[PDB]
Structure formats: C-alpha cells, structure tokens
Amino acid sequence: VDQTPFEEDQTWLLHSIPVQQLEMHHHEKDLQDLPFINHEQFPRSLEWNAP
Amino acid sequence: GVHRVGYTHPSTLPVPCAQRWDLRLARARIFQEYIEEKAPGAWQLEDERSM
Amino acid sequence: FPFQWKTEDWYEYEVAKVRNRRFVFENTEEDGIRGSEVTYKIVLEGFWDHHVMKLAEDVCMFLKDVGRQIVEEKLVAVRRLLQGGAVDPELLAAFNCARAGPFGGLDEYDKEEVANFLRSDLRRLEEQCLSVINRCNVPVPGATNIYDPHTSWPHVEKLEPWVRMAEFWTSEMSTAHYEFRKFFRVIICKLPFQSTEFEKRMYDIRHWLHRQTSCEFHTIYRRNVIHDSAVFPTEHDPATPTTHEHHRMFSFALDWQSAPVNRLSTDTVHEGESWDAVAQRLGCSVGELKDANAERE
Amino acid sequence: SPHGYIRHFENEVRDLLQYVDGVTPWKQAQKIRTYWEVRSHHPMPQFNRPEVAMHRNTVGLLPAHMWETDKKTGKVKSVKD
Amino acid sequence: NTFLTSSVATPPISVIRTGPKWWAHPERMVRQKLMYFTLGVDQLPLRRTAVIQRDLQRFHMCKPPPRVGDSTGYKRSRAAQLNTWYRRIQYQEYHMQHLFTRHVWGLLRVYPGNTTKIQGKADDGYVGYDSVPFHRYNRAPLPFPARELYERRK
Amino acid sequence: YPFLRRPHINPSAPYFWSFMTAKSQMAFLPEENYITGDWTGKFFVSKRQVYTLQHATSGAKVRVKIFEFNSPSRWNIGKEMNTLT
Amino acid sequence: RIGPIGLEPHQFNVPAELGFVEQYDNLQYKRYDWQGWYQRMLDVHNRNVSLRCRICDLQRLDGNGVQFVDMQTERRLRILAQHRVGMGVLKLDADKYEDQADNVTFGTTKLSELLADARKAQLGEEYWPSVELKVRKPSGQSKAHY
Amino acid sequence: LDRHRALADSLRAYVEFSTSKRVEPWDARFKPFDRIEKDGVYVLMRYMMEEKLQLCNYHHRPVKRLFCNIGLMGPQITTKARWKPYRFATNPAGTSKAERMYQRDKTVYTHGHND
Amino acid sequence: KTVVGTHQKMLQRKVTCFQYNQYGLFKTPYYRLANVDRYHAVQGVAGTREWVPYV
Amino acid sequence: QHWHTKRSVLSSLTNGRTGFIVDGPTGCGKSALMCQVVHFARSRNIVTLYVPDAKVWTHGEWCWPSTILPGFFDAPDAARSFLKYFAVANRATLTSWKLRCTPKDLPTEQGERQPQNLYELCEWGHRAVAPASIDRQSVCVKFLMDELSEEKKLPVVIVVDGWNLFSHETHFRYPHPDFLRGLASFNESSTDIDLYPQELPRIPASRLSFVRGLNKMILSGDDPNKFFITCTTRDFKPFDGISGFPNVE
Amino acid sequence: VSTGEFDHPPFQFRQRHTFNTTPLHDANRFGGRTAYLREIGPKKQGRRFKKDPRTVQFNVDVWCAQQTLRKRWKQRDWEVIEIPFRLVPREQQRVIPELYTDIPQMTDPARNDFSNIRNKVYDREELQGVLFPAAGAMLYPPLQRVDKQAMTLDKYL
Ligand SMILES: Nc1nc2c(ncn2[C@@H]2O[C@H](COP(=O)(O)OP(=O)(O)OP(=O)(O)O)[C@@H](O)[C@H]2O)c(=O)[nH]1
Numbered sequence A: 001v002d003q004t005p006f007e008e009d010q011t012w013l014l015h016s017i018p019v020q021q022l023e024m025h026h027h028e029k030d031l032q033d034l035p036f037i038n039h040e041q042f043p044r045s046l047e048w049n050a051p
Numbered sequence B: 001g002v003h004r005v006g007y008t009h010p011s012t013l014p015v016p017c018a019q020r021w022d023l024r025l026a027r028a029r030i031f032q033e034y035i036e037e038k039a040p041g042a043w044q045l046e047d048e049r050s051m
Numbered sequence C: 001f002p003f004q005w006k007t008e009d010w011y012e013y014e015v016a017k018v019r020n021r022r023f024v025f026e027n028t029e030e031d032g033i034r035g036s037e038v039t040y041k042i043v044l045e046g047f048w049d050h051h052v053m054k055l056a057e058d059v060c061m062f063l064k065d066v067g068r069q070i071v072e073e074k075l076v077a078v079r080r081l082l083q084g085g086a087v088d089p090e091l092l093a094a095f096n097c098a099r100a101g102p103f104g105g106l107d108e109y110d111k112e113e114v115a116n117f118l119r120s121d122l123r124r125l126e127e128q129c130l131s132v133i134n135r136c137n138v139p140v141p142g143a144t145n146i147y148d149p150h151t152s153w154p155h156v157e158k159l160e161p162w163v164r165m166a167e168f169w170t171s172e173m174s175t176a177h178y179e180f181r182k183f184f185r186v187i188i189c190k191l192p193f194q195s196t197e198f199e200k201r202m203y204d205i206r207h208w209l210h211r212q213t214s215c216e217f218h219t220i221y222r223r224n225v226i227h228d229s230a231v232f233p234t235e236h237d238p239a240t241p242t243t244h245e246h247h248r249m250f251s252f253a254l255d256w257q258s259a260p261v262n263r264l265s266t267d268t269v270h271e272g273e274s275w276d277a278v279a280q281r282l283g284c285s286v287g288e289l290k291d292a293n294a295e296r297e
Numbered sequence D: 001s002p003h004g005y006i007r008h009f010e011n012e013v014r015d016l017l018q019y020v021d022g023v024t025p026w027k028q029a030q031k032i033r034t035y036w037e038v039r040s041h042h043p044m045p046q047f048n049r050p051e052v053a054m055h056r057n058t059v060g061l062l063p064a065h066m067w068e069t070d071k072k073t074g075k076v077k078s079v080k081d
Numbered sequence E: 001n002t003f004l005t006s007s008v009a010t011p012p013i014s015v016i017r018t019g020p021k022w023w024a025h026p027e028r029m030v031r032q033k034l035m036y037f038t039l040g041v042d043q044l045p046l047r048r049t050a051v052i053q054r055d056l057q058r059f060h061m062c063k064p065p066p067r068v069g070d071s072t073g074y075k076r077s078r079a080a081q082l083n084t085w086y087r088r089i090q091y092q093e094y095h096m097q098h099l100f101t102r103h104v105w106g107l108l109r110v111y112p113g114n115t116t117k118i119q120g121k122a123d124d125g126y127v128g129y130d131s132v133p134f135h136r137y138n139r140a141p142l143p144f145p146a147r148e149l150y151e152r153r154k
Numbered sequence F: 001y002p003f004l005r006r007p008h009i010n011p012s013a014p015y016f017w018s019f020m021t022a023k024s025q026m027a028f029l030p031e032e033n034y035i036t037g038d039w040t041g042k043f044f045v046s047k048r049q050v051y052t053l054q055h056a057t058s059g060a061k062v063r064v065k066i067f068e069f070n071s072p073s074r075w076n077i078g079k080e081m082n083t084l085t
Numbered sequence G: 001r002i003g004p005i006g007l008e009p010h011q012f013n014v015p016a017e018l019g020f021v022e023q024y025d026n027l028q029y030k031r032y033d034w035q036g037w038y039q040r041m042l043d044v045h046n047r048n049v050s051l052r053c054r055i056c057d058l059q060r061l062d063g064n065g066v067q068f069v070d071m072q073t074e075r076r077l078r079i080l081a082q083h084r085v086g087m088g089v090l091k092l093d094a095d096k097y098e099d100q101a102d103n104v105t106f107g108t109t110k111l112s113e114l115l116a117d118a119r120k121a122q123l124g125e126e127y128w129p130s131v132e133l134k135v136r137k138p139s140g141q142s143k144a145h146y
Numbered sequence H: 001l002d003r004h005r006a007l008a009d010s011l012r013a014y015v016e017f018s019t020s021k022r023v024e025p026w027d028a029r030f031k032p033f034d035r036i037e038k039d040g041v042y043v044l045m046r047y048m049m050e051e052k053l054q055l056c057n058y059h060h061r062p063v064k065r066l067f068c069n070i071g072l073m074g075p076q077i078t079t080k081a082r083w084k085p086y087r088f089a090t091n092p093a094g095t096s097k098a099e100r101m102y103q104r105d106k107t108v109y110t111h112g113h114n115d
Numbered sequence I: 001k002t003v004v005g006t007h008q009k010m011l012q013r014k015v016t017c018f019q020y021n022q023y024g025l026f027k028t029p030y031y032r033l034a035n036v037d038r039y040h041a042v043q044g045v046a047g048t049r050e051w052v053p054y055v
Numbered sequence J: 001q002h003w004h005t006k007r008s009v010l011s012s013l014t015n016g017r018t019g020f021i022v023d024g025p026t027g028c029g030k031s032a033l034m035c036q037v038v039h040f041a042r043s044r045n046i047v048t049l050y051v052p053d054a055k056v057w058t059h060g061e062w063c064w065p066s067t068i069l070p071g072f073f074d075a076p077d078a079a080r081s082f083l084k085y086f087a088v089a090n091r092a093t094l095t096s097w098k099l100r101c102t103p104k105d106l107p108t109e110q111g112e113r114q115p116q117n118l119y120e121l122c123e124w125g126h127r128a129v130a131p132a133s134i135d136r137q138s139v140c141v142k143f144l145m146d147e148l149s150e151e152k153k154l155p156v157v158i159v160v161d162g163w164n165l166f167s168h169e170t171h172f173r174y175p176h177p178d179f180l181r182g183l184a185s186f187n188e189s190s191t192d193i194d195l196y197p198q199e200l201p202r203i204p205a206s207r208l209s210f211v212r213g214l215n216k217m218i219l220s221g222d223d224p225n226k227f228f229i230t231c232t233t234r235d236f237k238p239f240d241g242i243s244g245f246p247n248v249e
Numbered sequence K: 001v002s003t004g005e006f007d008h009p010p011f012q013f014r015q016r017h018t019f020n021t022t023p024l025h026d027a028n029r030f031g032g033r034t035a036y037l038r039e040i041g042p043k044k045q046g047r048r049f050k051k052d053p054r055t056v057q058f059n060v061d062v063w064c065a066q067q068t069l070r071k072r073w074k075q076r077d078w079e080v081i082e083i084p085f086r087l088v089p090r091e092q093q094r095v096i097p098e099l100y101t102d103i104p105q106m107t108d109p110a111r112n113d114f115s116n117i118r119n120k121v122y123d124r125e126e127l128q129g130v131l132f133p134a135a136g137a138m139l140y141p142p143l144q145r146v147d148k149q150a151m152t153l154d155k156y157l
C-alpha cells in the first residue's frame, strides 16, 4: 500500500513532514567539510574528464 | 491517491512480455542495488536548484 | 528561425548533454583525425601559463619526430605485407570456426578470401599511417599551429586552470584574497596501432620535464573481451522468482554469490545409463559427449 | 582489496559477522536492553507529542495513583517514593 | 487582505522619496489605475503623478551645473517653486490612494489591518488579534473573537 | 561561526522523550551504561549514561562529574543525566 | 590489439575500449621515504578503468549463426543498464578494487553478467521488455456517458 | 524533590490540555467561514462532521485535517480561509476574552501547551 | 532472506556488545579537531576566516 | 429562431452535431463572443440557458449531494443564482411554459402558490429561506432538466462559458467513508482522518445534477431542438517547468 | 519562466509592517509555511535552526520542490501501462533509449512528425482492442472525429 504524489498544495502543507534542524549531511560531500572548507586531495581541473 | 501496487505475471497476459519490476529485480541482482521497502511513492522531489 | 521550443524538451536536452559528456568512443575504425586505434592524452600541469605553454611546444616537437619515426617503420611493414605474404593457418581457422555462417551452415573460407580480408584492413592502415606522416611534416617554424588537429600531429588541447581562492584575516581588521592556481595543457596523440615502443617513449618524458612542472598520462586503447556463454549462460527464469526480500540491506554479502556461478563440469554415470542416456540427462548431443570423453570408449 | 563504499566489501562483511558471533556468547548479549525496555519502568513512558496526534491523549494515560493533588486548584502537591 | 498585523506609519515625504522603487513603481501604479477605472472615475491625479515621475527619472542621472552666483534670488526661487508644486500633487495622490482603497474595502467586506480606520464601518482604529491584548490607542480590552465589521452571509 | 559545531557542549512536558535524547527507542543504550572490559573502577561516570531501574533499585554509588545522587526515584528512568541536572 | 580470442561458437568476441590513468610524481615525491605511500595514493585514486563498448559492435553474428544482439536484446540491455548506456555506448566504470588489474577483471564479469541477462530476449517473447505507453484518461466524450 | 513534583504537574497539565475543549480555530470574518450558520460550511459541519469535531475537542491541527478529508469544500478550505493563530487557537472553550491567553499558568513547563 | 526473526535480533545484540567491548574505538567525528596548525600554536576554528583549508 | 423549416440547413452547419464549441488561445474572443450570443438570442425572444462562468459550478465554494438523485451532487450556491437569473431573463417565455412532466404535490408552505409555469417553478426553487433553499434547488434543477428535455417545439439555446470545466473533474473530491460510518472514539477506531490528510478520487462533472441534464440532451438523439453554442476557458495558472510561491501582492 | 519567489530573504534587524517592508517571518510568505520557523516573541537546538541561513534556505528548496511536483502531477492526464511490443503502434516499434541517455528523439521524421516520443500520449479509445480484449463489449464509445472537408459554419457555408 503506497500513496501517489499529491496534486493540491494544502495536502503538502498539512502533512506531518519534519523540517531540517541539525546540520545536513551528504554521503560523499562529508569528506569535504563545508563549502568554505571544501577539501581537494589532488589539484585537478574541474573540467577534467576521466578516460 | 492511496492504492496498492499491482503486478501482472506474463502467464496472465494474452501477449506475454517481460514486466518492469522483474527487470528492476534483474537490475538489482547484477549491480547489487538496495531496495528500500518503506520508500514512499509520494516523496519524489527533484533537486530543482541543480536539475 | 526564430527559435521557440517547449520547455520540457529543453529540460531534457540540458540534462542529457552533461550526463553524456564522457560517453564517447575515441578509437573508431574510420578516417583521419577523428578515427584511431589508441589515444594518448598527456595532461601537463604547471604553476604558470607560459610554463605549460612552452612545455607543450617542447613535448609536441619531441612526439612529432618520434611519432613520425614509429609510423614510418610501421609504414614500411604494411607495404611489405601488401606486396605479398602467406596467410596464417591460425588465422584461416579463425574464419572457419562458427557452426552456421551468414549463408547457412559452415562458411568455408579459402586462402584467397582470408587474405582478402587482411588486405582490406591493411589498405585502411596505409591511409591512416599516411595521415599521421603528412601532418607531422606540416608545422615548419615559419608557420606553425600546434593547437589545430588538421595541421600538426600531435595537437595541444586547452584545459581550464584549477584555481581555488582563500579568504583569511590579515590581522578582524581586513580580509586577504589569495588564490592557489595551476594551468593545464593536454596533448592528444592518436595512433592507428598499439605500439609499446611509443608507450615506452611517452612514459619517459617525466624525466626531462620543466621546473616545478608535472604530468599524468591517459591511455585509451582497444582490447578484445570474450563473453563466454558457457561460463555466463542465458538461462530461463526460475519457477520461484526472487523478491525484494533478497535485495535488503546487507543482502549483497549474505544472499548473493559473486558472478559467475559455478556449474559442475564433472558427473558420475548411473546404473542403467548409456551414451544417449547421459547426453539426454546432460541436455547435450551424444557426439558432443564423446568428444569431451574420447578417453573412454 | 576493496576500496570506497561498504557495498564493495562483500567478503569482509561476511568475515566480520561470522567472527562477531564466534567470540560472543549469548549469556553476554542478553543483558543489553533497548530504550523502550528501560522506559517501561517509568510510571508513564508513553504519551503523544504535539506534532501529529496530541488530541488522542486521555485521562487514563496519567499515573494518578502515585501522586496527591490539591482540592482547590487541581495541581500536583506531592510525589510518592 | 491577509496583512492583519500591527503596522508603523511613515511620513508622506519618505514615501515619495523612494521614487521608482515603491511609490512610482510601474507595476504598482498600473493596478492603482484599475481601481479607479473599475469605479468609473477619472485617474487625473494619478496620471499627472506619473507624467511628472516619468520625466523626473529621465534626467535623474544628470549632475546639476554649479550655481556660479546670482544677484537676485530668481531662478533658485523658481526651481524651488516647481519643486514644491510637484510634491503637493504627489501628496494628493498619496491621499487619493488611501481614501479610495479604504472605500473599496468597505464594499468588498474585506477586513483591514490593525489600527486602520474605514470611514463607513469603523471610525476608530479596528484592531484584530493583536499581540497587545488591549487597544493600543483607545485603552479598551479586545474581545474574543475579533470585531465583526460586516454582516454574515456572503 | 559554523552551525552547531561548538567544541564545548531544560524541562519540557510534551517533548520529554525527544529533547536531549535518542531519536529512536529501538536503539540500544549507549556504551557508558555497560562495562567494556576489566576495570579497576571509575571515579566518575559520563553524563550521557541513561538512568535505568537498577540505578534507583540498587543505589550503591552514583558519581557524575561533582554530583552524587542520593535521591532514588522512578521519574528519572528512561533519560540520561544531562536532563537530570 | 591485445586480448583473448575465442574460436568456439559459445564465445563471442567484443571489441571494447579501456581508458585508464597512470600518474607518477617527479617534482617532490619522486623519491624519499614518502614515495611509498604517495605512489600508492596516486594508484588508488587512479583505480578507475572505463570499459566502453558500442552496441553496434555487439550486433554481429554469433557462432551458431544467430545474431548476438538483436533489437529486443538491446531493448533489454538499455533497461538493465539505465545510466550506464549513453549515446549508443555501454560504459562501465570499475571502482571496486584498489589496483586497476582487478578492476579490469571485475569490469569484465559485470559486462558478461549484463550481456547474459540481455540475451534472454532471444529465448522468447515472454522476455521481451514491455513498451511503456502513456495512455490517456478516458476523454470528455466518454465521460459524458457517466 | 520538587522537580519530580513539577514534572508530574507539567505532564498533568499537558494531558488536561489534550482532553479539554478549545474554541473554534476558524476565524468567522473571512471567506467562506463568514457565512450564516444555516448555509454553506456550517450546514456541512452540522450534519456530516458534527461528531468528528466534538471528539477531537476543536484543536486546530485535527479540525483542519478533517476539513481536508471531507473533500466537499477542498482544497481551498484551508488556504483561502484565514485561521486563528497558534497562540489564539490554544485557548480553551468559552474564552470570550483576549486576557485568557495571558491568564494561564506560567509555572508549568508545557511549552505553551497549558490551558 | 536467510537471516530473519530471532536470528536477526540476536545478531544485532551480539554486534552491539562487540561494538561496546572495544576500548578505544575512534568514534570522534572529523571536524572536532581538524583545525590544528603545524608551524605555530595559534588555534583557529574551521568554517571561519581564521583557517585556510588547502595549506 | 425558425428551426423547423431550416432543419437541414442547421444540420449541415453543425455537421450533424448538437452545437459548436469555441476554442483558441487564452485571452481571445471566447467569453466576449459568448456574451454576444445571448445578446443575439434574447433580443430575438429565444429562451436561453446562460452559464456566465463555469467555475462557479465546478470550482465552487462547497459541494452537496443531491437530495432526490442517488449518487449525484449539487453546487447549491451556483444553483440558486442560476435559478434566480434565468427566471428574470426569460420571464416572457417561461410564463407561457406549461408544466408537462412535473408533479403537482410539491412541498409548499402557507401563503405560497403551487407552480403552474416554468417561471413559477424556478421561483419556487431559489426564493426560499436557508437552509430550506439547499434541498429545494435539487428538486427544482432536476425537474427543470426534465421539463426542458421533453420540449420538442420551442428552440432552447444553451450557452456555456468554459465547457472544458464541464468535460472533466470538478475540483471537489469525495468525502472519506469514516465521516459517514460513525465513530465512538478516535484512539480506538483504526482511522487517521484527524491525523493525516489524503487525496480521494476526484468527482467528475458528469455526477452533477446540472450537467446530468445537459449530457442527457446531448447524447440522446431525440432532441433536434437544443443548440449548444459553447466555448472553453484557458484561465489556468502558468507553469513552465518550475514553480515557486506566488507573491500575494 | 516562473515569477514566483524561490530564495529566502536574508537576515538583518527586525523588520516592521511598513511600505515595501514585510516582517521576516509572516503568514503571507510561502503560503504560511514560515510558521514552523517563526518566533512570536519580539531549547538551544530548537532556537538556532530558525536563524541559520543554510537551514532556512533548504526548507524553502523543499517547499518549492513540492510545488514543482504537484503541478507536474496535475498536468498528467494520462497513466503508464506496460503494453507488449507486438500490440504497440508503429511509432513505438523502435529502440527507445532511456531518459537522459541520448538526444531527445523525434517520433518519426520520415512521416513529418517531429515530436518527442517521451511526451506522446495515446487516447484510451484507440487501444480498446489491446487493453480490453477480455470484455468484448466495447466499454468505451468510439471517438467522434469531425470531418475537416465538410462545409460547416467556419467555412462560410
Ligand atoms: N467589446 C469587446 N471586447 C472584446 C472582444 N473580443 C475580445 N475582447 C476583449 O478581450 C478580452 C478577452 O475576453 P475573453 O473572451 O473573456 O478572453 P478568453 O478567451 O475567454 O480568456 P480565457 O477565459 O482565459 O480563456 C476581454 O477582456 C475583452 O475586453 C469583442 O469582440 N468585443
């Protein structure tokens, strides 16, 4: 038993959805600590294509 | 709205064909994909800042 | 004209263009500068933009004179192979290997047709070896452009510099904005054959690089892969199919074996079995069973 | 040797879990309790939070046998040991 | 109207000094014409407000020449004469907007913000669901629920 | 300052089990409420050890870094010592 | 072109590309006591090998005379490899093991496992992947009969 | 000794807050709740949703979700109609004054959930 | 599918005391002391302008 | 206006259909043409059913089930305004309209006359006190649509602004079955109607009593008398791939 | 192109209800969704997430993604039914790549039909022989298509 995505705005509003409270986490953007403390191991270019 | 997800076996259809769920199970068999059971069908939110 | 579109086609276009960035087949069986057999990319890295630019003139002139020599000694080998030679019997057995051909049954290729197929591929090899040599004789120092693929071999490709800035206090008084940066030049070497003499020469350019300038090597080569339909067979789906309960968390280690699955190549003959009864039980031909078991009559 | 995510460690997860029950007796692992098993010794562990279903709390969810309240205002006067 | 909070009043010279940002914003000025055009009245102080501010924004990047000196105060007093005339027109349209939108709000049965006077319905400041439980300026306690200014059925 | 990254780390009735406590009740008790190996005895226990029934039943020594709890009761069971002080 | 060659009819030859990065230091980490872990750190970071093969090269005849990949085979292949197929080229990026030699072996068995399940479409129509049609709701003419 | 008493006192006030009846959380000035008691929304509440609102005791979160699932006036029942604020909807039944929200007890720790 | 029910609950309890018996298990997050300077003793805080992440 | 002699002409104009639907982009002359048709027809003293905007019926304030029609619904506030203005518009023709299939035992309070005309029937429906006007319109609209579908002699032009709203689902949804089932308490009833909202299937426009009488005259071929010159509306909100929140001012 | 608000207003001193100035957490902004993160008065873990700029921006990014989802699902007047390859029409007898795999494919350029296959919607009254072969009673009526060559009112006859 599953539910379709809603079509009205008040159903998205009144549904029991919690908001973000603590610091958000990503599965691969956590080795890099923050966007200000973005850690890079090797100084490759950002347009570097892997062969 | 709230419904039950259905499945049709190829032996039931008048023209048999491979369904999309057993192809998903075949894709999950090869690449070892974790299938979350309580993943809600209503919560399909795109990252619209990037996409 | 003018360009007006539906937005969801534009939403599909911009996502498909970035996700298919490195979905490119470099070594294609084709014409000149697009087509090749092996592709070498040497990414040169230095702290100043004129340091990597002057190195890219030093390495390209090195790889031009070396790359002309290795193609020329390959060109003298193709023109001897095109003048005449004897066909390999291992090559002749490779064409007469399939059971059913395109025309039904065994396609018996003779010594003329197999020698015709290598002649059709060596005629392609001459036109690709002459494309490298004629582009290696173009960049005279009077008029040279090593950034264009049609003029010089190899050509130098631009790559944007990695630049990362730092924002720190100069003391809560003021903020300093200094950036680490290093510049890149990529050298694309496309050879229509795999030669280890050029790979040895390409790897040894690290020993005479410029000051505070390093490099890394990219190698895109063609390699034959065998899909064994006996080790990896095409089987019907089982009677009781798998569900989502076999694909839970930590089911990648506890429920599934690694590919491939072991299938027994040994069997024991039962009581009343014959040569046609074991072949019926094994689902094979009786002549196929005797060929693997030629020891026992 | 696998590298990166835990999904690439098939044998090492298998070699750990067999080693986990190999050294551990069940006489030791029975004493570890969860949070709700400890909370059952409270006079009242369970009541609704005001996010979803706070209106379903009834007066029978209160442990009224372990306190004494005043007769005038209705607030709790004392606690029982 | 969904702006029902207590507000802070501003002098009218600080409103007009915004200019093209809020006072003479073109998206705001066009929907003030549609209020007067619906009621069938002339938009005469609104158009002459817009004609002045159309030409005021046209030269607003130009630097004035240095006034080298006059024996009599004639062009200085004349330039201030036209400048005080342009403010009195925009003072009228600032009053013409606040008069008409409160007259429209008395017709459409729409409740205003806190401490806002509508001449037909509530001569005093109508206060509804304030943080302060009493009247801010009349010193009377507010009842629960809010004061009904209109009749019931739509 | 970064958000809630300070190195140096209150009663509420409707948020009693969800303020300064674990997210889930199915999760086990932390490491501070169990004996890891052979010990000679600790001078203090940590403040993130959840008060159980055996804390008020036995009541031998409660040493919180100081705080010595000589008032055993049943209202403390189910939450750690951060909310008890 | 290196690689094994199968002459048996149960072995198909797939001409495929392999792209990899080899990087060696020559400025600071060329030789000292830090060269041991830095060169290993460069090899583990460059553990990726890209196994690329065109679907057009897979549409050849097998040893039994039948085609290796037909239309229904690549229709099953594009669904089993959703984002791994792009612009007619099946690309496999192997990143499981630290050394590139084991990633070529892990990439080869993942290609052969993907090809073997896509080859079920040659068995019958019951393994042909179904077409997903966005069929409309019943129209206003049919809704008038309600 | 008094912290155990104040915890049981705050938990008692939260449960009696959950049991007591509140005032109508909808504001009777705005559309469509402005209409008369014998037409419109109040007809649908009197004959279909009369026991549904009386059992949940007129708290603002259940009665808005009962307006969602009743379907015969949504989805514009919740967004178009202005509701009472959060501190105003927590007032008990028979409030009739603006001083009652500050009249409640400040000693308990119900985090704004006391009558 | 192989391990379900009581075999799952006893394995989770066996892996919990195996987690708790390891004296010295480094469960400290990385950002707690990722601000240590090597040339001087000046202590900064990661996230602000008193620290640079590359050097 | 004289259709019985020009019947083969009118059948060739509509290509045998019952009427015309006018479709185009947003903001063109769709509703501006539809108000001209009632100006053309009511000046030629023809009885006209004019729906000035279909979003009062489908996207209305509140929905109520029909009293005499099982499984059907009503827009009561849209119906009382429809039954009011249609009586005043064609009072010259509806007073001459004799009730053929209409029961004469209608409920009637003291001082009111039983309706003998179709003008008197519509004034019986909308002119009442609340809440007695809610069930009176459901009886009146059903008996109006029954009286119009039997008339084969007088031309009745039916003009609808926004027929595309009558061709798909109204924005109302069906009520949850727990509201009509009855409950003793909320804690033990196996329900979450006060806990989580959910989207029921949407009610189509064919289940409305007003559109039921319209679709009865359209599909049944025994009415070569009603001409449905209608149009559509494109008054929907814009959405071009992404959507934030609309600014209230 | 959409004219709705996407970003959150930044933090400054406490705004008042003035001309061109709304308070920072009001019921008008984002449809009243700022009541979860507002403060009425003019616990440390429950106070600082209301003032963090990255935290309040992420919640509006969720709410705008919810508004993007409900308008994309309200546009759907169709549903996806897995139809086998044999009973499918001629324009679906080709090899269809997945999403974001290839160039956006035209349907059939040979028949001068340049449109995306992924947005193709088929009417249900066309596929009654495929979707319902077991009924045999024609549950849906045939679609009445108007004659384009017939002289009607739009062609001045
Ligand atoms: N007087 C007059 N005005 C017209 C005429 N045609 C268009 N208009 C103007 O065009 C505007 C559009 O009118 P509508 O017919 O309501 O637009 P629409 O096509 O119905 O728009 P939607 O309801 O969103 O589909 C009106 O406001 C009129 O002012 C006309 O023939 N006469």
Ligand SMILES: [Mg+2]
Pocket (backbone or CB within 6 Å): J030, J031, J032, J161, J232, J233, J234
């Ligand atoms: Mg219109």
